[PDB]
Design a binder for these strands. Structure first.
Lengths: 793, 39, 820, 213, 125
RNA sequence: CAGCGAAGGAUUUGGUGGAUUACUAGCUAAUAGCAAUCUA
């Protein structure tokens, strides 16, 4: 239950730093703020590393074995991570701002540009155990006079070519015996040298500067001593070079400027292969694939990330995120994608597994305040500060409906019908609730009776009663449908922000400004029970303010709460860097999550070092409708916290004779039901999978009819989280058919137990199985046409 | 932008062939996403 | 015994052990290299930060260590190791079996004295290299010439000579010619220390009766004598900043300061270190500086500074006494209890037999701080009792930290040796708290716990009664009386709903906590000594008296595992943070790891000291053990955080031993099965034209499969290559005169989807065929070969409606069951 | 065995509190006399409409029960009896007089039938409420009645109404008062004696429904 | 100098100010004890803040209530509201928060009108 | 007054030291030198 771990970070495909590819360039590693995201672009998936720098990261490299990563932040706190185990190996503090870090091509050394010293360390093994000091220093060279801007290793890991703000570039041999081969310095640029590369044969050296000159250096005679043979110029007048890279094998120089324009050249002849623009913001990063076919560009101001193949002129992806400006989120009615309403005025529909945005919608001319799904993922409603609620078909991607009032107000929250006839929206300057029909477009009603700004709205999903709650310290329940026009006001102790509604519509949980979460019975309007949450809230100290984090009244309350789908838990977040979840029977804190440890954000540290910034805040929390997770719209992105059953041995009434050995003996002796319930009492995912695949098709329905009723949600949620990605489609559908036929009355009379295990199953039937069935159906009908009709002339 | 950035609490940030069209919706590989009534 | 889960990382909390440290000087800064057992540690003397720790543990204890500029020379059992930045550069094996026990380094020479009164000289090869490396000669101090060698020094400007300080004599060797230049007269008492003065050719000798001699090593006389009666002299140091002071260090822990110019005694720092641990073991002035670094055997390293004089004209006669400056320290006695302060594995609480509670940092050793015992004020306003001569609290039996409400109120609850109340502490302030919870039955505190709401603390007395206090306000809330003998374990649920107590009468009581009922009581077969509650999985483990570990869950109150194998009393145990393993340690000098899923012993370590405490980190990072000897905390890292270990039992289905199940490729040949690959490949193939608008071997294998009537290699190549390659191979298939390549592809897809594997890909390959050149198939429809190939493709493909009505049933009934 | 200590000093206050008042902190009884546990509703379909599961100290809960439809199904049935007792033009508003005569009638119910008077009044409700009734199917005014069933809230409503107005007319000009006539009415309705106005009226309504069923 | 706490209890036009401080255990309404609060049939309406939570909460504190306005039943409802939320506020400020929200849970399970009145009315239908 | 109460108790304040981010040493013209010195 409560054992959530940080899974993913949706939104924000790039923040600051350098993009890296893999060696077999399938994944790309992107520095999001202090995490690192890794997007696998072929196997369409994505993860974010769990570890966390304390400032924004500025350098990334992983060796070409793929086996370990090193990430340096913007004051030199390096972190060495095991890339396969996903666990951090060492924390090493270089003392000043490191501009670049690079592993050697042979993997065994890495070097980095810390200030004006090039320092080469040698890589610790991944097979060795963790030591107190795993890095052993090779050397530290100081020949530059100002800060080094770039490294480049040679093809053999033998020379290293560094570029500085000082107007030179230098070549250093790795070992001392080749010191005479590499002792030259390369002058002649008017500005900062942005890059210095070898050719494929390491005979020519190209040095690209900030003003726009690329110099070709050759070991010629005018003795032989590294002349400059040709200077080529970009002649981009106002713009200047922001990032350079070179693929030496395909002779491809890729250059991004401070105007969004990037050009890519075939270098020793200097012929413009292509020139095109990311946008208007500067191109902060260029990176290239190992085969040189993909170019990943990152612009840091809008947080955007291209990877673009330059042969077939086409963008593998275009993915722009939102730093700090995200007002709301909503899970799709199957937990496959999250819709994000963001303050720059747009809707963005992010896939969860593959961490990318599918569609974006810009028809609001101001900050979109709320999104909400309806009609089972077919329609999606959003309300913004420009005065409009509007509806979005997620099939034809059209804004088909726009609802305004008559009073020119700005809407801050909405709520739709279950049977989506009516949308409803509340403002923070009008004290009314606006009730629109969705079929026609008209303003059906204006509900009046709050004496304070309507902070939150929610329709009960079962009996369709409206619950609004406002800053006049009052939650209010409106019976709209069918001749009632009934109003029931429940007073509460302080002013309310974030009401939420149970999945059965029985109760409503409100968050108040005191710091509490009160839970009320709707039909008999009396309080069922409250949680006192203002003492398990982490409220950090800002830098500008002159009052301690203990005595602050800034963020000791929750501005967004949400029920779990079994109705038993509440996740909650606010303008603080803790999100807390509770179980509402016992009113006790299950777990508290620190949403950021970035010291670049403001409200993170409670105690500031006695030796504006974007504050940290969560603006919306939601539980996943299909699989045991929650998304939180922080300032860093959409933090996705999820459990997984691979770890955490948590049995269910095992005894001493219940053992993996006992389970495989019962499987080998083919008591299949006993093996299945032994694996359920182990609650071990590999054992459940092993027994599940070992049961034959002949006796799926006998086992599925004899499964005990306490192990029913376990086998249903297992079949869901297995069958989304497993290939055994007919096996999983046979099991689903046998379970629904044998015990599908228990499910119907215990709806909210199997409310997230059944939504995960019909995330498998309509999303892989129905697509396959559509393909075979179209093949059958094209066959019947192509052989049944007359093609003659 | 500038009047509502100073009238607020929380922080607000601010020819070649193509500007790559980085922001673009409608795409789960949809081509004829029009309505049958629209057609 | 080497392990396969945990590997040794460091032993934290150690600063010194009373080997005389060495000082070294890089440029104008100073470092201080102190021995901690078998490693040394380099400290930055301007701030006492831990720069370096030696990379490997030496095979025995380091016994004499010196430091020139970049290099540190550490002598242990037989040999001298030359270390730079911790990493060992060289190892000088001596040709003896005698233990090397002194050394000096001057010039190209390293001179190492053994304990059989032989001296080994080692020489550099060429005077430009970094350390003395080659053997040169051997010197011997026989019984005629002098006693046991008590020090080995080189006083300056002495061209390749060596002052050897024996117990009675002072010899002077020429170490190039191997000669004994000068042997002094005898000394009437045994001399223990020596230090060269910054005066030219003067050494200072310290005797076992109380006198400092100032021997002039060129005249052969003694210049002056300083008498400190009944004090054995253990250190000598000289001030070198224009103030001629000497600092002697006395093995009753005293540091006495003398003016040599005006022959007075400046000041005495009394009890600067403990006499019982050796007194002041090494004291030295950082040269040119008024700061002196002392170190003692009580695991402590201090600095004292001389402020400038307070009289603006006299100065030299009004010498302000030395004051204290920075210091590092740890426990002076081996720790008795261990806990982790937080889930981040950053701080760990640690209580010792020297009656101190330290908070040690696993990230940076400067952050280690002693929790203060300065009591608060009484709540009413009455007087607090106790002695006026303040001493530390009795040594800590148990403790329990739960930082849910940290900074808010009292946070740690701790139980001391043979006293009837449990103190509280605040980890945020790092100090004691306002409350001492009584037991209310005149019994000593045998266990403590506290809930994870942070509101409640639980005291378990030796007369068998649990008392539940409030941590905020410090008052009795409830009191359960079930046991009659001593309650050794209390814990509570993560939801404050069921508590579990275990006493050494061998009954585990299960109580409801909100209601004050008991849910049950289970009688085991031995007295229970210790409980550990794994709180997420609700499984608690008991160390019984019959040397078993009983793992029992609190939900259904059954013994669910029973782990046998320990040969003596189980000292400690702890759960893995995921709750899969349990690591125990017992008085047979062993540490075992048990996989309680399978119920067997994964790994065992025979460790020479008995491990008295074992704690996992609250993440899966580290194991922390605590042994009988050694003032620190031994730290291990689990290698199973980076690899996966086999849960296969030691003594003295490889996927099921490695907890995996690689899902088999297809379960039955009559079952449809998708590809082992991404699900999106079907959609990419079916719509890759509009996707991009929004953004040969094949022919030879096809022909060879048409010969052999087996297209398995063709279909393997098709399932292998990429969507652009698939479209470009299907789009070029010779659709013109006899139509062979089309019909070979069609009955290849027939042979493919007869096999019920990769069938969504075979379906899209047929869709791509009909899309690319289904117009030529429609054109020469009624052609015999292509019509028969499509006929048998439909013959196999018409058995695909099993999937259709299967997903129709699942969709319709799932919708009906969910909605209605 | 096992015992919990949860007070650690005998509680004494400076204001002296009566011994039965400080005995009332272990169980809530109506008027500190009549226990609410082991008071069951011996007829199902009326449990969840006669409410005896939140014990009270006096029949004067000033809560608001007339602003949703079935919210008066969880007013405690002693207070519903009290509120129905304070109705006519003479005795409107006088809830303290109604509470005082409810206290007197429960005292004399217990002194006549030595059993729990809350159990007696709950049995009187569940025996009085009619289980069938007739509506007048109109046809423009064709005088024909059709038997309908009757919902449990209407059964509890009409039960309290029949009992209270039977006590009024039984106390109309006899020597007995409203408290004594209501006691006789609740006792006879509890045992179901057919000597009460209330269950004679129930038997007439049910018999007419049986007639023109 | 003393830890003290002031709360308010209101029904229609009665209003009751309750001062709670540490003491010996005396509960006094309008100077007279709590066992004199007429109309004597609603004395248990006044008592139920004491009997719902036990007199061991009141064994260490002394309350005084000053009640003006209203009528008989409005004054007993003001008294019980003032006593209840005064005990809650005292255990908030000077005793632990766990006993604070245990008291809030007990009073709210009995009736939350001990802690929150029904104040602004009517409804214009 | 009672009570609390070990060769005393309370309040206030100045200075210094250690933490307030996760520990790979100083200098320079830096593949090494110096640190007693870079200069003939």
């Amino acid at each position: 239950k409560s054992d959530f771990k940080f899974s993913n970070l949706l939104g924000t495909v790039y923040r600051q730093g350098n993009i890296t590819f893999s060696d077999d360039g399938k994944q790309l590693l992107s520095p999001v703020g202090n995490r690192v995201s890794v997007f696998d672009l072929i196997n369409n998936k994505s993860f974010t590393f769990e570890y966390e720098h304390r400032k924004n990261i500025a350098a990334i490299d992983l060796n070409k074995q793929g086996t370990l990563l090193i990430s340096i932040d913007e004051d030199g706190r390096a972190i060495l991570v095991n890339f396969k185990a996903r666990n951090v190996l060492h924390h090493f503090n270089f003392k000043e701002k490191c501009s670049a870090v690079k592993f050697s091509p042979d993997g065994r050394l890495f070097a980095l540009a810390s200030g004006r010293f090039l320092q080469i360390w040698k890589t610790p093994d991944v097979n060795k155990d963790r030591q107190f000091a795993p890095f052993v220093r090779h050397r530290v060279h100081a020949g530059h006079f100002q800060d080094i801007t770039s490294l480049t290793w040679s093809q053999d890991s033998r020379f290293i070519l560094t570029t500085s703000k000082d107007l030179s570039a230098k070549i250093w041999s790795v070992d001392s015996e080749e010191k005479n081969l590499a002792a030259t310095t390369f002058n002649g640029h008017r500005d900062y040298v942005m890059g210095a590369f070898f050719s494929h044969d390491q005979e020519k050296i190209y040095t690209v500067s900030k003003d726009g000159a690329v110099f070709v250096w050759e070991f010629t005679k005018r003795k032989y001593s590294w002349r400059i043979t040709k200077k080529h110029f970009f002649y981009a007048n106002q713009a200047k070079v922001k990032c350079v890279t070179f693929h030496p094998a395909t002779r491809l120089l890729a250059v991004g400027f401070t105007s969004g324009e990037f050009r890519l050249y075939d270098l020793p002849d200097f012929t413009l292969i292509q020139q095109l623009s990311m946008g208007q913001n500067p191109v902060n990063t260029v990176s290239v694939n190992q085969t040189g076919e993909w170019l990943a560009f990152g612009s840091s101001k809008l947080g955007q990330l291209l990877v673009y193949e330059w042969q077939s002129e086409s963008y593998i992806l275009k993915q722009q995120g939102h730093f700090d400006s995200t007002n709301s989120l909503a899970y799709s009615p199957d937990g496959s994608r999250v819709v994000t309403a963001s303050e720059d005025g747009k809707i963005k529909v992010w896939d969860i597994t593959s961490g990318f945005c599918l569609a974006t919608f810009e028809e609001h001319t101001s900050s979109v305040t709320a999104v909400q799904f309806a009609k089972r993922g077919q329609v999606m409603f959003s309300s913004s500060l420009d005065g409009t609620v509007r509806a979005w078909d997620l099939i034809r991607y059209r804004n088909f409906r726009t609802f305004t009032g008559t009073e020119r107000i700005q809407f801050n929250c909405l709520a739709v019908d279950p049977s989506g006839e009516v949308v409803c929206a509340g403002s923070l300057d009008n004290f009314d609730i606006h009730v629109w029909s969705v079929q026609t477009g008209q303003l059906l009603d204006a509900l009046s009776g709050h004496e304070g700004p309507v902070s939150c709205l929610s329709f009960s999903q079962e009996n369709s009663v409206l619950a609004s709650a406002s800053w006049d310290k009052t939650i209010r329940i409106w019976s709209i449908f069918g001749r009632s026009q009934q109003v029931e006001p429940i007073e509460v102790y302080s002013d309310v922000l974030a009401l939420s509604m149970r999945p059965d519509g029985k109760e409503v949980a409100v968050s108040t400004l005191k710091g509490q979460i009160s839970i009320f019975n709707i039909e008999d309007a009396k309080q069922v029970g409250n949680i006192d949450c203002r003492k398990d809230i982490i409220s950090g100290r800002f830098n500008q303010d002159r009052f301690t984090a203990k005595n602050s009244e800034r963020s000791k309350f929750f501005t967004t709460i949400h029920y779990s789908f079994d109705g038993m838990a509440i996740v909650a977040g606010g303008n603080n860097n803790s999100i807390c979840l509770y179980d509402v029977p016992n009113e006790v804190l299950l777990k508290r999550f620190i949403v950021s440890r970035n010291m670049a954000l403001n409200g993170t540290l409670e105690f500031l070092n006695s030796k504006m910034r974007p504050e940290v805040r969560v603006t919306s929390v939601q539980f996943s409708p299909t699989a045991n997770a929650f998304a939180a719209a922080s300032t860093e992105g959409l933090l996705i916290y999820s459990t997984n059953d691979t770890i955490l041995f948590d049995p269910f009434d095992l005894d001493v004779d219940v053992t993996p050995h006992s389970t495989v003996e019962a499987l080998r002796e083919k008591q299949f039901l006993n093996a299945l319930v032994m694996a359920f009492r182990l609650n071990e995912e590999y054992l459940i999978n092993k027994v599940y695949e070992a049961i034959p098709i002949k006796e799926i329905p006998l086992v599925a009819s004899n499964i005990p009723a306490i192990y029913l949600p376990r086998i249903l949620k297992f079949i869901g989280d297995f069958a989304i990605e497993s290939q055994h489609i007919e096996f999983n559908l046979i099991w689903i058919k046998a379970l629904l036929s044998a015990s599908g009355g228990y499910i119907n009379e215990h709806k909210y137990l199997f409310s997230t295990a059944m939504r995960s199953i019909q995330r498998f039937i309509v999303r892989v199985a129905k697509e396959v069935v559509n393909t075979t159906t179209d093949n059958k009908y094209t066959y019947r046409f192509l052989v049944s009709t007359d093609g003659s002339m | 932008y500038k009047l509502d950035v100073l009238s607020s609490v929380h922080f607000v940030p601010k020819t070649p062939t193509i500007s790559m069209e980085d922001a673009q919706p409608l795409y789960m590989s949809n081509a004829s996403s029009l309505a049958p009534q629209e057609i | 015994k080497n392990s396969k889960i945990f590997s040794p990382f460091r032993i934290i909390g150690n600063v010194s052990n009373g080997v005389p440290f060495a000082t070294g000087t890089l440029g104008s800064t100073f470092y201080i290299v102190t021995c901690v057992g078998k490693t040394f540690q380099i400290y930055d003397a301007n701030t006492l930060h831990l720069l370096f720790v030696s990379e490997k543990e030496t095979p025995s204890s380091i016994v004499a260590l010196s430091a020139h500029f970049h290099y540190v020379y550490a002598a242990y059992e037989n040999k001298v190791g030359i270390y730079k930045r911790g990493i060992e550069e060289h190892l000088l094996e001596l040709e003896t079996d005698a233990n090397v026990e002194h050394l000096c380094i001057f010039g190209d020479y390293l001179c190492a004295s053994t304990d059989d009164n032989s001296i080994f000289i080692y020489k550099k090869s060429d005077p430009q290299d970094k350390y003395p490396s080659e053997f040169y000669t051997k010197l011997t101090v026989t019984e005629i010439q002098g006693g046991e060698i008590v020090s080995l020094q080189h006083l300056a400007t002495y061209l390749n000579k060596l002052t050897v300080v024996t117990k009675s004599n002072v010899l002077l060797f020429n170490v190039r010619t191997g000669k004994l230049v000068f042997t002094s007269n005898e000394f009437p008492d045994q001399i223990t220390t020596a230090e060269p003065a910054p005066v030219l050719d003067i050494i200072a000798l310290g005797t076992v009766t109380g006198e400092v001699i100032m021997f002039n090593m060129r005249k052969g006389k003694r210049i002056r004598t300083i008498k400190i009666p009944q004090s054995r002299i253990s250190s000598l140091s000289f001030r070198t900043d224009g103030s001629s002071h000497l600092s002697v260090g006395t093995s009753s822990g005293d540091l006495i300061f003398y003016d040599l110019d005006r022959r007075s005694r400046i000041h005495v720092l009394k009890n600067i270190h403990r006499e019982s641990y050796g007194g002041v073991t090494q004291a030295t002035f950082l040269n040119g500086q008024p700061i002196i670094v002392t170190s003692g055997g009580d695991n402590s390293l201090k600095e004292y500074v001389f402020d400038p004089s307070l009289s603006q004209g006299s100065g030299d006669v009004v010498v302000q006494p030395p004051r204290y400056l920075r210091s590092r320290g740890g426990h002076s006695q081996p720790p008795s209890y261990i806990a982790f302060a937080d889930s981040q594995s950053h701080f760990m609480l640690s209580a010792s037999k020297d009656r101190s509670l330290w908070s040690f940092s696993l990230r940076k050793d400067a952050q280690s701080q002693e929790m203060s015992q300065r009591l608060h004020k009484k709540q009413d306003g009455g007087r607090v009792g106790g002695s006026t001569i303040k001493s530390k609290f009795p040594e800590i039996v148990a403790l329990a930290i739960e930082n849910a409400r940290i900074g808010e109120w009292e946070n740690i609850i701790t139980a001391h040796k043979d006293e009837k109340f449990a103190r509280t502490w605040d980890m945020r302030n790092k100090r004691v708290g306002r409350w001492t919870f009584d037991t209310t039955d005149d019994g000593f505190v045998k266990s403590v716990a506290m809930s994870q709401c942070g509101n409640f603390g639980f005291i378990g007395s030796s007369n068998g009664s649990i008392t539940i206090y409030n941590m905020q306000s410090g008052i009795l809330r409830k009191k359960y009386k079930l046991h009659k003998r001593a309650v050794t374990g209390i814990s509570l649920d993560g939801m404050n709903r069921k508590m579990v107590s275990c006493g050494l009468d061998g009954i585990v009581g299960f109580y409801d906590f909100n209601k004050s009922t008991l849910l049950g009581k289970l009688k085991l077969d031995a007295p229970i000594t210790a409980m550990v509650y794994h709180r997420s999985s609700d499984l608690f483990a008991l160390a019984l008296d019959d040397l078993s570990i009983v793992v029992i869950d609190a939900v259904t109150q059954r013994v669910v595992r029973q782990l046998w194998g320990h040969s003596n009393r189980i000292t400690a145990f702890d759960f893995s943070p995921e709750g899969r393993w349990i690591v125990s340690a017992s008085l047979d000098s062993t540490i075992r790891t048990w996989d309680l899923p399978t119920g067997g012993c994964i790994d065992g370590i025979i460790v020479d000291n008995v491990a008295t405490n074992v704690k996992f980190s609250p993440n899966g990072d580290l194991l922390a053990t605590t042994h009988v000897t050694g003032n620190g905390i031994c730290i291990w890292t689990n290698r199973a955080q980076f690899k996966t270990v086999s849960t296969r039992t030691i003594d003295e289905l490889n996927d099921i031993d490695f907890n995996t199940y690689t899902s088999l490729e297809q379960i039955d040949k009559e079952l449809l099965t998708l590809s082992i690959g991404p699900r999106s490949k079907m959609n990419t193939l079916l719509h890759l034209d509009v996707i991009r608008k929004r953004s040969s071997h094949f022919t030879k294998q096809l022909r060879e499969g048409s010969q052999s009537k087996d297209y398995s290699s063709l279909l393997a190549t098709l399932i292998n290559f990429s969507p652009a390659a698939v479209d470009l191979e299907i789009r070029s298939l010779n659709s013109f005169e006899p139509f062979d390549e089309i019909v070979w592809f069609i009955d290849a897809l027939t042979q493919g989807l007869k096999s019920n594997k990769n069938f969504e890909l075979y379906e899209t390959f047929m869709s791509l065929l009909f899309k690319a050149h289904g117009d030529v198939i429609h054109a020469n429809n009624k052609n015999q070969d292509i019509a028969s190939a499509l006929q048998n493709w439909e013959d196999v493909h018409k058995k695909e409606d099993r999937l259709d009505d299967l997903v129709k049933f699942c969709m319709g009934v799932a919708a009906f069951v969910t909605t209605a | 065995d096992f015992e919990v200590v949860e007070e650690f000093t005998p509680v004494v206050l400076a204001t002296p509190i009566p011994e039965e008042v400080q005995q009332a902190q272990t169980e809530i009884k109506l008027f500190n006399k009549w226990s609410f546990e082991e008071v069951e509703v011996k007829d199902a379909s009326l449990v969840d409409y006669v409410q005896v599961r939140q014990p009270i100290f006096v029949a004067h809960t000033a809560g608001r029960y007339a602003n949703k439809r079935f919210r008066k199904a969880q007013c405690p049935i002693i207070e519903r009896l009290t509120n129905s007792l304070m109705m006519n033009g003479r005795n409107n508003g006088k809830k303290l007089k109604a509470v005082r005569i409810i206290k007197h009638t429960l005292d004399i119910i217990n002194v006549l039938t030595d059993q729990n008077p809350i159990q007696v009044v709950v049995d009187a409700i569940t025996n009085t409420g009619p289980r069938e009734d007739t509506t007048r199917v109109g046809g423009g005014g064709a005088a024909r009645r059709q038997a309908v069933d009757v919902s449990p809230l209407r059964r509890v409503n009409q039960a309290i109404a029949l009992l209270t107005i039977g006590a009024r007319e039984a106390a109309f000009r006899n020597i007995k008062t409203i408290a004594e006539t209501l006691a006789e009415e609740l006792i006879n309705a509890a045992k179901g004696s057919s000597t009460s106005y209330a269950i004679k009226k129930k038997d007439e309504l049910e018999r007419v429904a049986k007639s023109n069923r | 100098a003393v830890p003290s706490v002031q709360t308010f209890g209101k029904k229609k036009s009665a209003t009751a100010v309750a001062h709670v401080k540490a003491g010996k255990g005396l509960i006094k309404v309008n100077g007279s004890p709590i066992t004199l609060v007429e109309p004597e049939i609603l004395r248990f309406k006044v008592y139920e803040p004491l009997l719902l939570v036990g007199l061991d909460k009141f064994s260490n504190i002394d309350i005084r209530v000053r009640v003006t306005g209203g009528g008989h039943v409005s004054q007993v409802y003001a008294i019980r509201q003032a006593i209840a939320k005064g005990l809650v506020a005292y255990h908030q400020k000077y005793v632990d928060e766990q006993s604070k929200n245990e008291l809030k849970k007990a009073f709210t399970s009995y009736d939350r009108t001990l802690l929150i009145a029904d104040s602004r009315r009517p409804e214009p239908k």
